[PDB]
């Protein structure tokens, strides 16, 4: 199954937006000490954290207090990580986000499940105190989870600097929703060279930083342009030379030709390490025109 | 009897293509760990592999996992390879394709059967991961079997760089359907130089690689042109200088002349080793007239 | 008695053609391990050679397999070989050909019977395997059998590229049918110089090859022209400057004169080795008008 | 008595010709190894040769086999040679002709009977075997027989090469007809000189080659012309200057004059050896008129 959980106030916003837009095959869960935030957020399972220590009045800038509030409701928390694929979303540098995420990642690992972590670095102007905590959380998180995706918040101010705040954070959510709606297709309707969950587990096992996302294109070179757009999202870290895995899930129509598929494979292969491990596969449907989607994963 | 067994996703695709086209005298069997592929494939015997290890997910990029999975259900596959002629079709460089090829080819050999392997090399621009294990599978398969046919996908891009997705793989499948039609044609319709399965098991139990496939012609030199077309199929490998077999099966109408038949034999006789062995045969019927087919097998 | 047996596919074809045309005073036997050929052949006494070792599929390019199969079923085969005149016809190169002709010839020889063998050589452009195998078979047959008749198959190519294989192998059948109808004539309708089987046993026992055959003529020099046509028959390029036998059997009508008969004898007596043993004979009837048949058993 | 026995195919043909023509006072016997010829020969006593050595098929161009076969049935053979005058007809150079003929000759000689043998040399263009066999047979026969007659077949070519074989051989039969008719006309009916069997025994006792024949004439010199025709028959041409016998007896009519008889006597003695006895004679009957026959048994 697919379970996406949000730890901290930042994670609750991502869970809220993801649930508002709606996804298929994924279950939304929110974990946060402050009961005030959980009241306004919308999801299915709202597992309140350690009220016996926090009572629901926030954590503050102390990851130790977040960890102490965590690792107390583990008996209740263990039931939610009993799935196949999990997406832990947490804004680092805060309170419960930097403390509950490590213990939840370890708990999900002990349940033998694939983990993907979505973190967001704080604004540079927030302060050295606010950024050191986020760096500490990020460095220790990659030792537990096998895939970490980092979205620097200040990057939003360099790509989309004129929006009504919420939609500025919508770009950060775009990566997560795209990855979830792409993976839920990779574990769905097959065809030709269709992949399954085993390939996903192989491509996302003990690697580190990862890049995921999808795009669309309806030009003459539909597959190539869609892949190029998906692999180069503006708000992601531009570092793909040191990559040792890949996954391509072209979902074009009958108009797609073998030359275009081979060109897409060449374009993904030429931008990463020569000794890469490409696990591709094409799903084909006789309902759409030249438009071709492209789900891409790197690590 | 004639059995065609597919291994891996490529094997399932080839078996589906053969079943849709319709083959006389052949029985289709598909074996692959991924239960999704077997669910969405078309075949008579759908023998699932060792789900006790990797139920319904797939071997990924791990030939050893497929090797272990096949050995789990080795008893179930022993009762299906107990035939006369077997065609193991599997796309090398993958998962179960590279792992269920060795143990099933050996299993078929222990039943005293004539083995023909149809494999497809992966794309050159697809990473060294897909290429090294494909080479390993080819090297181990030529050891366990006596006839191996290789059709690299790159050649397809140099033959049909256009048309829909399935047409390229159908062109890859053309040689196998042509060969299975030729083999099932020798058993029926005895001719003047009538051949039988004993002659077939003279050129397929020796040497390594081989080239098979039929063709058609309707000009004045019908037999000669048909033989020249069948001997030089585009996507097949071009190596006829080092050949030590021939199974020419000129099957034309009464309009065929002795000069044309002798010329057709001499055409293949002059393009192979001087010390080669020819086991030719001819079938004559009054229903095709000028049109003459030509089934050719090398080694 | 007159018995003609055929070993191999070529032997079966010759037996079928001879039965189709019809022969009086002769019996037809077919021996070939390939039960597929026997199922569609036309004859009277069919013996399936090698019922155990071959199983009825075929022999392939293995004369040793044919030899073993012949040795397997000697008991049921010796019964039919007990006669006076036997015609063993075969196509060299095959498993049931060169590997099964010497054994049956030896069985006939150790039965006190006159043995005549007719072999068909393979096409020159069929590799060194067929040529060497045919040479070995001919060498091992001429030692045992007393009179062989060799018609290379390329003679049909370089003489009559007229019709299909079904109507050009009939041109190679002319030798055997002409010999049989013309040997069965000696045992009927005694003439003025009446001959019988005791003379045949003398003329067809020297050694080596023979050019037996018959022809007809209707011109003023009926006997001479018919004899010249019969002795220099096509497909027989073997030089006849050396010979030690003759069975001229002029069977003309009352119009024949002493001068014409003497010229018919002399034309043969001048075209062969100077010292020779002519066993000529003449049959005269008031029904053929001017036509004169020219049966000759020159060896 | 007069018995004519034929050995060999030529002997059987001559016996059939003589029986068809009809001769009074003579008995026809045919002896031949092959029963096929005897089944069609028109004769009274058909005594088969040595079936025990060889069945009734043929001799096989071998004098030894025929001679050995004759010795097998000597007991039955002797039953017929117990007569006064015997005519052994045999075609030399063949099988039983060079076989039973010497043994029947010696049997007749032992039985104290007058022996005359008629042989026919084979055609010159029939190889060295036939001529050598004929020479050996003639040399052997002249030893054990008191008189032989040789009429080579090649001589008929220079006399009447425009007649059918069945009728032109009757031209060679005229010698035996004249011999068997002149002898009968001596023993039967009286004459003025009245020669009997004593003179015949005198003129045919251990001499060798001889010329025997009769002729008719009706000119003014009937007796002179009739004698000259019978003394110079076109078939047998030998130097008569060395002859040592004569049986010139005539059968003229009343018109015959003493001068004509003296001239008929003198003409023979003019062209032969001046020595040796001329046992002449005359028969007179009042029916012939000017027509006068002439029989000569010159030796
Ligand atoms: N990209 C985004 N970052 C966010 C968002 N909301 C908060 N954040 C970031 O996350 C960080 C704050 O983390 P939290 O809200 O989990 C802090 P804490 O657990 O102490 O929250 P309370 O207990 O509710 O006070 C900080 O760097 C923010 O800039 C959002 O909607 N998008
Ligand atoms: N010529 C073709 N090659 C194919 C086709 N499908 C797959 N392949 C090739 O075969 C290889 C993939 O092999 P498989 O599908 O057996 C890999 P695996 O066993 O891991 O499949 P899953 O367990 O379903 O993931 C790869 O090189 C493909 O390019 C096809 O239809 N035609
Ligand atoms: N002149 C002819 N040659 C023939 C004919 N059929 C076969 N052949 C020749 O004979 C040879 C083939 O021999 P066979 O048919 O006996 C082969 P084999 O004994 O292996 O029979 P199978 O087991 O049925 O294959 C080859 O040289 C042919 O060219 C025919 O009808 N005519
Ligand atoms: N003048 C004739 N010569 C004849 C005649 N028939 C045969 N011959 C000659 O006699 C010779 C043949 O002798 P035979 O017929 O006795 C030979 P053989 O005893 O072997 O006869 P078969 O046993 O019947 O084969 C040969 O030279 C012939 O030319 C005939 O009708 N007339």
Author numbering:
A (entry chain A), B (entry chain B), C (entry chain C), D (entry chain D): 34 to 332
Copied sentences from the primary study:
FtsZ, a tubulin superfamily protein, is an essential player in cell division in many bacteria and archaea. FtsZ filament formation is GTP-dependent, and results in a GTP hydrolysis site at the interface of two monomers, as is the case with α/β-tubulin. An Asgard archaeon, Candidatus Odinarchaeum yellowstonii LCB_4 (Class Odinarchaeia) (hereafter referred to as Odinarchaeota) uniquely possesses both, a tubulin-like gene and two FtsZ genes. Overall, we report the presence of two distant evolutionary paralogs of FtsZ in Odinarchaeota, with distinct filament assemblies and differing modes of membrane targeting.
For cryo-EM analysis, we incubated OdinFtsZ1 with 2 mM GMPCPP on ice to promote the formation of relatively straight filaments. This enabled visualization of thin filaments, resembling the single protofilaments typically seen in other canonical FtsZs. After refining the helical parameters, the 3D map was constructed that represents a single protofilament of OdinFtsZ1 with a 44.5 Å helical rise and a –2.72° helical twist. Although the overall resolution of the final reconstructed 3D map is ~3.6 Å (FSC = 0.143), the map quality was poor for reliable main-chain tracing in some regions, and the resolution estimated from the atomic model (dmodel or map vs model at FSC 0.5) was limited to 4.1 Å. The map revealed the canonical FtsZ/tubulin fold, featuring an N-terminal nucleotide-binding domain (NTD) and a C-terminal GTPase activating domain (or CTD). The CTD is composed of a four-stranded β-sheet flanked by two α-helices on each side with a long central helix (H7) connecting the two domains, consistent with the AlphaFold structure prediction. The N-terminal domain consists of six β-strands arranged into a sheet, flanked by two α-helices on one side and three on the other. A non-protein density was detected within the nucleotide-binding pocket using Servalcat into which GMPCPP was modeled. The phosphate binding loops T1 (residues 39–45), T2 (residues 65–68), T3 (residues 90–96) and T4 (residues 124–130) (Löwe J, 1998) surround the nucleotide GMPCPP. Although Mg²⁺ was included in the incubation mixture, no corresponding density was observed.
